Design an enzyme around this catalytic site. Structure first.
Site, PDB file in Angstrom:
ATOM      1  N   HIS A 147     -30.271 -36.888  44.560  1.00 52.55           N
ATOM      2  CA  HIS A 147     -30.722 -37.923  45.484  1.00 52.55           C
ATOM      3  C   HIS A 147     -31.545 -38.965  44.735  1.00 52.55           C
ATOM      4  CE1 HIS A 147     -31.788 -39.663  49.308  1.00 52.55           C
ATOM      5  NE2 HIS A 147     -33.082 -39.467  49.114  1.00 52.55           N
TER       6      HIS A 147
ATOM      7  N   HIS B 133     -32.763 -33.248  49.316  1.00 53.45           N
ATOM      8  CA  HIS B 133     -33.846 -33.972  48.630  1.00 53.45           C
ATOM      9  C   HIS B 133     -34.087 -33.392  47.251  1.00 53.45           C
ATOM     10  CE1 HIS B 133     -35.252 -35.045  52.893  1.00 53.45           C
ATOM     11  NE2 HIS B 133     -34.716 -36.129  52.360  1.00 53.45           N
TER      12      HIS B 133
ATOM     13  N   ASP C  32     -38.985 -39.331  45.953  1.00 51.48           N
ATOM     14  CA  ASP C  32     -38.780 -38.118  46.700  1.00 51.48           C
ATOM     15  C   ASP C  32     -39.342 -36.837  46.006  1.00 51.48           C
ATOM     16  OD1 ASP C  32     -38.041 -37.808  49.207  1.00 51.48           O
ATOM     17  OD2 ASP C  32     -35.952 -37.352  48.788  1.00 51.48           O
TER      18      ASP C  32
ATOM     19  N   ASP D 147     -32.222 -45.570  50.149  1.00 55.41           N
ATOM     20  CA  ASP D 147     -32.436 -44.224  50.632  1.00 55.41           C
ATOM     21  C   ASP D 147     -31.306 -43.644  51.469  1.00 55.41           C
ATOM     22  OD1 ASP D 147     -33.751 -41.906  50.478  1.00 55.41           O
ATOM     23  OD2 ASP D 147     -35.412 -42.393  51.804  1.00 55.41           O
TER      24      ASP D 147
END
Ligand SMILES: COc1ccc(Cc2nccc3cc(OC)c(OC)cc23)cc1OC
Ligand SMILES: [Mg+2]
Ligand SMILES: [Zn+2]
Length: 324
Positions: A83, A79, A118, A228
């Site tokens: 990402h 994360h 995120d 995602d």
């Protein structure tokens, strides 16, 4: 509690020019951003301009924003900043094949949503933060991390000269934060299963309508689950490589559960790697395929994503049958 980018960092981004070869390749779903780490910020900026206009945002404002976004993602295995851009590009890819079906405002919000969805993750799941009563769990009873992401987003907009949405009308401004909030929250997998189950029924019975704001939020929702997961939709050597990053994070967590005398789920237990190919097949079957299958039926020009996902399932099945 934020990190402002240095005055030299955002200046370089304005001077950036994307090489011609990339411009055509970006348009593709299966495109992988990995080989181009220092080009990432300018890759986002390019995707914005092409989707919203080279004059939609003040350019000086977008650059303070983006670099402040990068500087507020942690250095965790998965994360992380990579990402962010990966998830943002799948969005831009879905948008481009479905441009007119979404409004100028939506598209602006969805790309900022992904990049930010995120923000400042700690490589610790909700399960953990609630289970062992972290502060963030008390503040946000459900979708604990998601809600911290959204707040971090807004904190960055509030930073002097960062608010890219200033030029938007007060009616639109609040409208786009609601698009963004809903989108960021939608990425909580907890919410995913309700969402996909509903959208499936709304389609099978012909009762889906894109001008039905309730329906609208849910389709946006699934796009958020597609973007995602999208590393499940790239070529296998990339997919597998990212899997290593994923588990790197899970296992660091399971170690903490071990330390506090709680057996972590096989999935986060580093001493249980043999069960992994199983879990992935389980996850592809339970989550990914369904996710992409629906999103196809809803948005047919996204089917390349669902094809790639199936290819990655054959590979996992092949791993199980001892062919790797
Ligand atoms: C809670 O944290 C995550 C949530 C989702 C993902 C996305 C993902 N990608 C590929 C394969 C996956 C496989 C999974 O199960 C084995 C899984 O668990 C929900 C998530 C997966 C990664 C994650 O890793 C940190
Ligand atoms: Mg998340
Ligand atoms: Zn994410």
């Amino acid at each position: 509690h934020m990190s402002i980018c240095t005055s030299e960092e955002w200046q370089g981004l304005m001077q950036f020019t994307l090489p011609v070869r990339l411009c055509k390749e970006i348009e593709l779903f299966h495109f992988d951003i990995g080989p181009f780490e220092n080009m990432w910020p300018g890759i986002f900026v390019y995707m914005v301009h092409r989707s919203c206009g080279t004059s939609c945002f003040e350019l000086e404002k977008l650059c303070r924003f983006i670099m402040s976004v990068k500087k507020n993602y942690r250095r965790v295995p998965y994360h992380n900043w990579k990402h962010a851009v990966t998830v943002a590009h799948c969005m831009y890819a879905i948008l481009q094949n479905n441009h007119t079906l979404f409004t100028d405002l939506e598209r602006k919000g969805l790309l900022i949503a992904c990049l930010c969805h995120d923000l400042d993750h700690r490589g610790f799941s909700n399960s953990y933060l609630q289970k062992f009563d972290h502060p963030l769990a008390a503040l946000y009873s459900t979708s604990t991390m998601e809600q911290h992401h959204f707040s971090q987003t807004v904190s960055i907009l509030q930073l002097e000269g960062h608010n890219i949405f200033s030029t938007l009308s007060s009616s639109e401004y609040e409208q786009v934060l609601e698009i963004i909030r809903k989108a960021i929250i939608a990425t909580d997998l907890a919410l995913y299963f309700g969402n996909r189950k509903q959208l499936e029924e709304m389609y099978q019975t012909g009762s889906l309508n894109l001008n039905n704001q309730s329906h609208r939020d849910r389709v946006i929702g699934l796009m958020m689950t597609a973007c995602d997961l999208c590393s499940v939709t790239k070529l296998w050597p990339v997919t597998k490589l990212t899997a290593n990053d994923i588990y790197a994070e899970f296992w660091a967590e399971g170690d903490e559960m071990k330390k506090l005398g709680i057996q972590p789920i096989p999935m986060m237990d580093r001493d249980k790697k043999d069960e992994v190919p199983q879990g992935q097949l389980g996850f592809y079957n339970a989550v990914a395929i369904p996710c992409y299958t629906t999103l196809t039926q809803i948005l047919p020009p996204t089917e390349p994503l669902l094809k790639a996902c199936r290819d990655n399932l054959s590979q996992w099945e092949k791993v199980i049958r001892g062919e790797e």
